[PDB]
Design a protein around this ligand. Structure first.
Ligand SMILES: [Cl-]
Lengths: 93, 93, 93
């Protein structure tokens, strides 16, 4: 069964990738969640150290800034999910 | 070799997915690690701003809260690892 | 087309895994980015609570420490990308 092994493997791939995509989304969701807390912490610190110019000036450091890249991961996930659907679609016609 | 291409591709899939699962676990481990530091930071801030009602009241903001979803990622990883084992198991009988 | 299904599935796998690897890298990049902010926050707190021994002593807690594991994820990604290249290479000779 050649045809058969092709369908089989395509569905194995698809079922693994559904779980990977799910995981990627959830890891990104947790970064987004955690970042809101971290930046609320930073704003609180900026107020506490305002007399000294806020957190970075207070320390005598260049500011570290968070670069949120949820857009990239979200895009890659949706592309993976498209590829899953396309493989199934192609087998279906 | 049809049979052969099926075994081959199944093992390629399995070896890629072992590394993906490993990565997902490690990303989750780092979120868990980092979150403990962020929340210790928050508790410290809640004490420093206690006279003002803690961090959120001090800022005049609704609190941001971290939603830990390690359970979801852990579950998806273990499901991926089950699927790896099942494919190998099926080829073995 | 047995040969054909083997090439096809190998390239499907490869194109999904390129996007997974990309995602893993980006999730790690965001952890690295966020961790710099969290630890700058911690250092600021250590100064504010220095009279009390820094953040952990101030709270009466054992310190929580961030364990960065970018090296692990970076390694797994590069291994996945090697496996992609090797599959293509093998089909090419
Ligand atoms: Cl923080």
């Amino acid at each position: 069964g050649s045809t058969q092994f092709y369908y089989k493997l395509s569905q194995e791939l698809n079922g693994d990738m559904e779980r990977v995509a799910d995981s990627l989304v959830t890891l990104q969701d947790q970064l987004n969640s955690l970042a809101a807390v971290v930046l609320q912490n930073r704003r609180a610190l900026d107020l506490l150290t305002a007399e000294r110019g806020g957190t970075c000036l207070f320390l005598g450091e260049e500011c570290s800034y968070y670069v949120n890249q949820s857009g990239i991961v979200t895009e890659k996930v949706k592309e993976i999910r498209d590829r899953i659907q396309r493989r199934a679609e192609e087998l279906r016609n």
